[PDB]
Curated annotation (Swiss-Prot):
Molecular function per GO: ATP binding; ATP hydrolysis activity; ATPase-coupled transmembrane transporter activity
Pfam families, alphabetized: ABC_tran (PF00005)
Subcellular location(s) of the protein: Cell membrane
NCBIfam families for this protein: cbiO, PRK13636.1
UniProt domain ABC transporter: residue ranges: 5-241
Protein name stated in the entry: Energy-coupling factor transporter ATP-binding protein EcfA3
Lineage: Bacteria, Bacillati, Bacillota, Clostridia, Eubacteriales
Organism from which the protein derives: Clostridium perfringens (strain ATCC 13124 / DSM 756 / JCM 1290 / NCIMB 6125 / NCTC 8237 / Type A)
Enzyme class: translocase
EC number: 7.-.-.-
Length: 251
């Protein structure tokens, strides 16, 4: 019940023979916010595609929810119901319809009692802060609102894991902290595990319990962000108290 994903000695090579991930060991705790950090080309998408089964490891394995992944068609279908994906650009995920039609599209085809669809969708919209936009056309929303609609559409299925692909995209730093604090809050109320792929090492990690730094398809650092970015954190606190001394420490 500690780890929602354990990656054990995982290797991945593309079918052309390109070695993408090497001896990856990663233990992701249930009900924490974990981020996987690194610039492009580091292998974040390759890792995340293994998590939801679109790729299968060449060597080693992944335990999801304490159990091996079942790679049959049925097993993959089951695994993806447990795992919600929020895309970088919400346009890639949203329908042109009202916020309520889009978000409720998911429940509507699972044959639930209507009043259970009602609760699920309304709770989803409250939980993402977008009740007031229930009847607004998606095409009229800000990027930030759209992203909240994407998240809400995924909450409706009650996944166990929420995976966000670069959640800082299209957002100013205060935009970023808004979305991060929203995610920290929904975990408090839902117990959902949050996994983030990002290159942002400044804001995103202040909201994380755990962090993995990747380079050329290997983990090279890991742990509590307070400890991993111990030095950046000292600087941050200095700016907070003595604005000018902290810039001589960046000098």
């Amino acid at each position: 019940e500690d780890y929602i994903l354990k990656v054990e000695e995982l290797n991945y090579n593309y079918s052309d023979g390109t070695h993408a991930l090497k001896g990856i060991n990663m233990n992701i705790k249930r009900g924490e916010v974990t981020a996987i950090l690194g610039g492009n080309g580091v292998g974040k998408s390759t890792l995340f595609q293994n998590f939801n089964g679109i790729l299968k490891p060449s060597s080693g394995r992944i335990l999801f929810d304490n159990k091996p992944i079942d790679y049959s068609r049925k097993g993959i279908m089951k695994l993806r119901e447990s795992i919600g994906i929020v895309f970088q650009d919400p346009d890639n995920q949203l329908f042109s319809a009202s916020v309520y039609q889009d978000v409720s599209f998911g429940a509507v085809n699972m044959k639930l009692p209507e009043d259970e669809i009602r609760k699920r969708v309304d709770n989803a919209l409250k939980r993402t802060g977008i009740e007031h936009l229930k009847d607004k056309p998606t095409h009229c929303l800000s990027f930030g609102q759209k992203k909240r609609v994407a998240i809400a559409g995924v909450l409706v299925m009650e996944p166990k894991v929420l995976i966000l692909d670069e959640p800082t995209a299209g957002l100013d730093p205060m935009g970023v902290s808004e979305i991060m604090k929203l995610l920290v809050e929904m975990q408090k109320e839902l117990g959902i595990t949050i996994i983030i792929a990002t290159h942002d090492i400044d804001i995103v990690p202040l909201y994380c319990d755990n962090v993995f730094v990747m380079k050329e398809g290997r983990v090279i650092l890991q742990g509590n962000p307070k400890e991993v970015f111990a030095e950046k954190e000292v600087i941050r606190k200095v700016n907070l108290r003595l604005p000018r001394i902290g810039h001589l420490m960046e000098i």
